[PDB]
Design a protein around this nucleic acid. Sequence first.
RNA 1: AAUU
DNA 2: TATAATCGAGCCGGGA
DNA 3: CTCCCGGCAAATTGT
Lengths: 1111, 84, 176, 53
Amino acid sequence: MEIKRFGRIREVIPLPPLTEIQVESYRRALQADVPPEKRENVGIQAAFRETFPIEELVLDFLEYRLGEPPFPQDECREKDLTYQAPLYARLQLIHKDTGLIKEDEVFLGHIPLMTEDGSFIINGADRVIVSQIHRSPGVYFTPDPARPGRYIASIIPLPKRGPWIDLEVEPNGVVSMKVNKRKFPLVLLLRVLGYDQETLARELGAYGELVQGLMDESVFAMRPEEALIRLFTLLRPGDPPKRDKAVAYVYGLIADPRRYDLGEAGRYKAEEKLGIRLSGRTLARFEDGEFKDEVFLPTLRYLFALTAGVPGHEVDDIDHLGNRRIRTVGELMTDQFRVGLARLARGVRERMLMGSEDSLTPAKLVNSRPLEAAIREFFSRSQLSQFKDETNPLSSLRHKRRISALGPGGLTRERAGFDVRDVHRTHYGRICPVETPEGANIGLITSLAAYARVDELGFIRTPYRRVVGGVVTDEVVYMTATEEDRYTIAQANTPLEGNRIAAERVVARRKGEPVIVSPEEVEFMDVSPKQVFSVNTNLIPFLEHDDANRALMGSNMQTQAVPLIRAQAPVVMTGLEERVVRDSLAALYAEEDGEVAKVDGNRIVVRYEDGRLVEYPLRRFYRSNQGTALDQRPRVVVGQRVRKGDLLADGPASENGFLALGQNVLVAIMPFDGYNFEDAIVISEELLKRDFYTSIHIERYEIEARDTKLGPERITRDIPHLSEAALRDLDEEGVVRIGAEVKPGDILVGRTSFKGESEPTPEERLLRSIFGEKARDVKDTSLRVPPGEGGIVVRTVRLRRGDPGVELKPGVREVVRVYVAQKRKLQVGDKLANRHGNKGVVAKILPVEDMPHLPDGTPVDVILNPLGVPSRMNLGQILETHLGLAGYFLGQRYISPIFDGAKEPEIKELLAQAFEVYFGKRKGEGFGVDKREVEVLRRAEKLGLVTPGKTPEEQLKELFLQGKVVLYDGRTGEPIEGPIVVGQMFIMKLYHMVEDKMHARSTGPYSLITQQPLGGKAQFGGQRFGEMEVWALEAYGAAHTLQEMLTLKSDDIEGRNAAYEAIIKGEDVPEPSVPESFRVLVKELQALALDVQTLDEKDNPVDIFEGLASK
Amino acid sequence: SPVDAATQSLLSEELEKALSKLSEREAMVLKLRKGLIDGREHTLEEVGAFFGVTRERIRQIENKALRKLKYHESRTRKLRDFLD
Amino acid sequence: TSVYIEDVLHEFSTIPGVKEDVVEIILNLKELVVRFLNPSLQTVTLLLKAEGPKEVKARDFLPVADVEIMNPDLHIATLEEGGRLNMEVRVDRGVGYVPAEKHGIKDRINAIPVDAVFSPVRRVAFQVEDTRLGQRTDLDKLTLRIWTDGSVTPLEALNQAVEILREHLTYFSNPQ
Amino acid sequence: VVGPQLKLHQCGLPKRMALELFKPFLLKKMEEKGIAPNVKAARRMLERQRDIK
RNA sequence: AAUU
DNA sequence: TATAATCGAGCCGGGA
DNA sequence: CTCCCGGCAAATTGT
């Protein structure tokens, strides 16, 4: 079919590589493909130079190398292994006394590798490292909230790489410095740096009242040494002020490039704000035996001039995106590497004391356990290392571009107010204003804008076009927020003739503030509207018509779309849906030009120009993290001539290379008999018939057989007391056969466990004895299908001990995994959504004959209630339908970009051409206007919809141009009394499916200490009837209902047993007993040496333990 | 669990209903041999000492006791469902 | 209603040499329109064996007496050099839409039950137009458009429809 | 899910949910009707989903 | 981290 | 059982 | 005043 694209905007540059924030960051950290002498000092390289040399014997760092991975990516996932490279380091040991040099290359453990698409494999599971926003290091000046006319100067280093410093000017007039919660007069520190009153008096004197608050006579009376000892006694009480000890403490706090690290970005921000040059990343130096100042005097100088109102001095906006920077994967990982490196150094010095002080190499001196643990800790347990969202290809693409303000070195959820969550003006073009979580995390987690890229310092830059004179260049400059505030930036839609600005007045920005400006004043221009929003937001056509709160839901919900076997691209696209599939890496493309040699379900073989025969295996029905099926399908045929970059296979949720998150269905907007109520959705059974919204899902089942003190667990087909019906589908070994249909209760893997010591009860001994089946040594522990699950068995993996290549955790003989697949047809309770935030659960499935239908017999697919539109103010879905109607008859799909889209006249033109096909066909076939079409036309003209006095064809066309048609009720045959909006809409089946959520429990597992039911469906849990639920029962005055919740249905052990027995005997449930959790409370208060006594009306003790606890 | 408490209780009650339908002398031997009394499964020689008879005599009343037990079971179908 | 492909254990399988996965192959078999000439024949079993670089269409099914394939051009599987496709498809007569989970029909162990859309009727519209007997006005002219897959005829449909409706009106006979 | 046809005092309750929620009651009724020999046998019949008549 |  | 080793490394309200 | 301790919605799921 035809693809018609709208919009007049010529975008000078394509979207950047979308995972570059991930891919480029880690490559930069490892530099594995760079030869060691040419590596720059960054990432891993910089970490080594910081930890070494290790003094105390001196151990020095030469170079490192990364090996090749022990196992490929597919293999790691199979075996629950981390995808990683061996790290080695060449170290030379020197004895400073002797001169002796022993050198060896020591093994430091493994480092995890990033895959091509920017993710990790950590113990078999795919993970993503989320970038972290935080305050950029540098020197900031903020207004003091208490005293309006005064200011605070803060010197902030990288997280955990030094303390925060505050320079406050107290009301008494002296400049105070705050470090580690302790305050003192800053003058003391100035003297330690070697400043004398001559230098300080003459330097800052220009500011009249301020220089005197710095002057303290007693401090000048003492040399830098007396001042150093004096300060140390202030900061560390009780520690003897030994002269070598004070240098050591103070040096480590200020001048040590090992214990105090300003950023590289910190240096630039400092150099730029104060107009100085830093020799390094420390606030001071230890040079020529004394301390030599770097930062403090320039920072003190700026503070005094600002309080005085000196021109050229400003306060810093701490939420400005120039002062807030991104910590990418590489930087985050390197930080953990540096910590692990420092612990290993602690280990070196302790080994340089014990055992032979002579006979030591680097191999005996280095224990890498501290390093392996630090990295394993970051990847396994960090708050920024998250389980990959791979529900659909877009899920993972969005995850990698997310920005978190939480995690180790940022806010807590109870610790962040409004300012951080707000949308700052500098977010324009950098961080998306729409795509953020609804709920507690709103504004803390955000997403990178489409055209944004993070530079080497960690600041987000966004592209703009140069405008010189009135000419718009094609040169794009990626700008930081700080640099953007200098210019006047015109909007991207400002009219153009050629490269010349064609409007006399343009809409532009100065510091984000909107302003109207002449073409002479235009320094730059936005590249595109797409640059303001995230990738998800950019997939919403007609976004300009949707209220943001709903567009937010639209963005996020595409993340949850389940891959459909029939998945299709939307009939109205934004033009980004090709790039997302390509950068996602689900789809497979041709490397160079060539010819297709072979096409299979399992593989595609291509003959290139090179003559070389390249084979691309295809991932078929593989189970993703969320159980959606990632499966690739071949899109070319044998012998097809393909070019470089031509599509070879479709990934999941892609159709001919376009993102397919859903289906295009014929929708009617109208109430329908209350099945539409309050966002519910009505669908045609025709959708299931043709397998729309059907998705494949795979669940993984696992079981271990382990050594016990009672003897081995065995995986066997021999299970005590089981029929051949129950074992039918198990193979020789006890594993369910591939292909069998398994239903709840069915055995997946047979297993036996040795009966404990209190073996069969004497009751059981005698019962079995009666039947002459002597009691077995083992019990049936087999893995079974959980309630509500089941499907077709597609795979089994078995891993024993003693088979090549596999070793399990201690005690585990063998591990068996069963992969079970299901084709899920759409059903009542499943959740649907469009890209505009309209979401609802399927409440009714009508037979095709009940569905409203067009006069020519075509029934609609979905009926959405119009009551969902007006309050939500998301009208893009309406425009989507009109253009979708036109496309249904013209057989075409459209690209309408955001904010430069199809407009009403253009949609009307397309609709007229459609009407010609929808109607002229009928008139030629020998059919005229319907009687009922006339009745509706009568009522429509009463509505002012059609012009009175035109022919029925003319009026039906007037309605068709409003996107409305005559609709017949399939029940009656009578028309709907008014014309109804009908068209093609793009709707997704989200990951929330009743099959997953339905749960019920009579009785089941109980908790150890409280004896209350466990929680959650997976444990067969009970529902929590919490405080507020108890209030409800109380307000109803339902005392006996409530007491049941508190006793027989929970932790009253005696009561629940008796209550169950009564129900199976037909008796009424007995009166309850003491809840066991009260007994727990009583004993816990006794453990606190508090005597809690239940007493009767006579004040005599009542024993709620029934004699069991008294001697 | 509530189910288990119910199940084991019902089983103890049906077992006793069947053992009272045995002579006292031949029901006590079965209880001593399967451990329902004292928790231990007594040897054939020990049961001989407490009823003062021969090790073979005690084996004989256990099989006839167990056989008579088996007969009452085929008749009332009471204990069959507890075999799981 | 059911499919057995040789050396295929379940629906999520894939066949060497064949481009389509089994899910798509069964999706194509759901479009097969199969007419039973003998009214007494309620179930049959089509056989297909193909190899080599050929595109299997519905014609390649082995002809069976009293059975006509109304769409012999329908694509089934694309096979490539060395690709071998051998299957047995069980076709039944029935009513309405009976999904695979419902009937669960398997001729043999490795059989894949298939969702059955039995109804031969593809589309139904009816026009109501104005007419007169020249004295009286607002009379109705009724035109029923009926499309079918060809196994049953638009007219045959209409008679069965009328016959069903007639038989239903009988049910009003015995009151209580 | 919305249930327009319900009277105000009613709700739609999935049969599979009700079988679990009412399971003890259901066992007794399965005994009165000859559907199972006794309560213990009735529960075993509900355990496997293909065993439910 | 999700859903309401 | 014996060279000698000798001091660590988030905002808010309310009540003493 | 300053500081020190106590608070800071519910149910559900997921690796």
